[PDB]
């Protein structure tokens, strides 16, 4: 039994966009949750199926660690039952989620004075995403009256729009990295227990 890649996920030099969020499956390692608080000045640490201090006691089989960046005023949207542009078109948690949502400010790392348009979010979609569904399609949205034929002509808009983080001023619009830890029952021989 070795250590978990928790320290290699929260301190990534490049974070995934909300429409291309990674899912690092964690198995066969001892979960040392003491390293989480060292690099996560959490703005919201609401756990919905576990306790933050009892993580070193319970044990799970497989742990999934999502990673995505969203707007500052959209941190509350990453929660079971929430709505919004992110909670409905980019990342939606189920009503029976069992884990914790970790989010911290990253204005000193994920922001540039010339505009960091490398992070994009989806604006519109014909239907909401299923729980834990990844949306990779970049096809031009159609207005319905006429097809766009792959070009963004009249009444044809691109589905991906950048955030454009501005480090000058403004609260609620700063870049915030979000990591979501998912725990499944999975009644099978466990592999990732606490450091006991």
């Amino acid at each position, epitope marked *: 039994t070795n250590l978990c*890649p928790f320290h290699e996920v929260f301190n990534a030099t*490049t974070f995934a*966009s909300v429409y*291309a969020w*990674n899912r*690092k*499956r964690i*198995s*066969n390692c001892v979960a040392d949750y003491s390293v989480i608080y060292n690099f996560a000045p959490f703005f919201a640490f609401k756990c919905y199926g576990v306790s933050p201090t009892k993580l070193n006691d319970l044990c799970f089989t497989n742990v999934y660690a999502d990673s995505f960046v969203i707007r500052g005023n959209e941190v509350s949207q990453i929660a079971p039952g929430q709505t919004g542009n992110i909670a409905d078109y980019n990342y939606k948690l189920p009503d029976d989620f069992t884990g914790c949502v970790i989010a911290w400010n990253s204005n000193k790392l994920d922001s540039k004075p010339s505009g960091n348009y490398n992070y994009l979010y989806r604006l519109l979609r014909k239907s909401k995403l299923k729980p834990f569904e990844r949306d990779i399609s970049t096809e031009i949205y159609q207005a319905g009256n006429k097809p766009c034929n792959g070009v963004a002509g009249p009444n044809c808009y691109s589905p991906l729009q950048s955030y454009g983080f501005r480090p000058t001023y403004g609260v609620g619009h700063q870049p915030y990295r979000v990591v979501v830890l998912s725990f499944e029952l999975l009644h099978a021989p466990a592999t990732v227990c606490g450091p006991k």
Partner: antibody, heavy 119, light 109 residues
């Protein structure tokens, strides 16, 4: 058992179209997301396209954007791939793969089809 | 896009342990999947989430994910394991499934 058979291509002139197909059996074809991976003779694996479980989400590579179109037919469990506007650098062995989970691993493969762009 | 680095060719003696790495920038934050492609056939999955193997793969295959480079530990490599191996990772780019440059594992017969 899990079976994937890709229909053979053939010799085609540049600018033409090649019609491929991938018959799958042994697993639930309407649940897993099907992909396409091509391999040129003497070259490594390169991703081509991804089709959603229902055909809504579609994505392609930058080197094959615009001309290639991916499609699936769940009524008969046959994966299709229209190779429109062929180019000399498109000569590759197209493999019919299947995505396992959200982490992005392939568990099911076929045998590959031969598509040669000759002049 | 992401750039997976593989060695051009790795030679291993029969019965020994062969190790094919796969480097990358911050590769630890993502899963590395391996495939075994024998000349004349299609690739076959061996280790997907850096630790587990599907049904039909012997226990001699193993992997790890730590630091800035992956590791595919294959022990007791017989003469019948001469094939090419490839990596696969999911990146924060425009999402092309980045495959490695390929590594031909040859057994000194």
């Amino acid at each position: 058992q899990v079976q994937l058979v890709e229909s053979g291509g053939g010799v085609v002139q540049p600018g033409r179209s090649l019609r491929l197909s991938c018959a799958a059996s042994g697993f639930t074809f309407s649940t897993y997301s099907m992909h396409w991976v091509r391999q040129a003779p003497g070259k490594g694996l390169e991703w081509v396209a991804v089709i959603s479980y229902d055909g809504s989400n579609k994505h392609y590579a930058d080197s094959v954007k615009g001309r290639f179109t991916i499609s699936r037919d769940n009524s008969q469990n046959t994966l299709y791939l229209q190779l429109n506007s062929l180019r000399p650098e498109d000569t590759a062995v197209y493999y019919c793969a299947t995505e396992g989970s959200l982490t992005g691993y392939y568990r099911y493969w076929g045998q590959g089809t031969l598509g040669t762009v000759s002049s | 896009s992401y750039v997976l680095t593989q060695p051009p060719s790795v030679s291993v003696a029969p019965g020994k342990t062969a190790r094919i790495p796969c480097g990358g920038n911050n590769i630890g934050s993502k899963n590395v999947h391996w495939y075994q492609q024998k000349p004349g056939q299609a690739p076959v999955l061996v280790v997907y989430d850096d630790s587990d193997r599907p049904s039909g793969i012997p226990e001699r295959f193993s992997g790890s994910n730590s630091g800035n480079t992956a590791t595919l530990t294959i022990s007791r490599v017989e003469a019948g394991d001469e094939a090419d191996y490839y990596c696969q990772v999911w990146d924060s780019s425009f999402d092309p499934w980045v495959f490695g440059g390929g590594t031909k594992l040859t057994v000194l017969g």
